[PDB]
Write a structure and sequence with these properties.
The protein is mainly alpha-helical. The chain is built from three helices and no strands. It comes from Homo sapiens (Human).
């Protein structure tokens, strides 16, 4: 990801793929993402969590 906004895009997309409950916590959503094999897409970014300031 070139910018944090691109990580944010993938974040929301994975939230849709994992049907993350609207009442789910940010940390819980992260856990559901980890379960997704596409997690590595976000893990690659050393500022993964720092890019999710719009969600945390």
């Amino acid at each position: 990801w070139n910018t944090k906004e691109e990580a944010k895009q993938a974040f929301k997309e994975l939230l849709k793929e994992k049907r993350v409950p609207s009442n789910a916590s940010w940390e819980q959503a992260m856990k559901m993402i980890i379960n997704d094999p596409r997690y590595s897409a976000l893990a690659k970014l050393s500022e993964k969590k720092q890019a999710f300031n719009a969600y945390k």
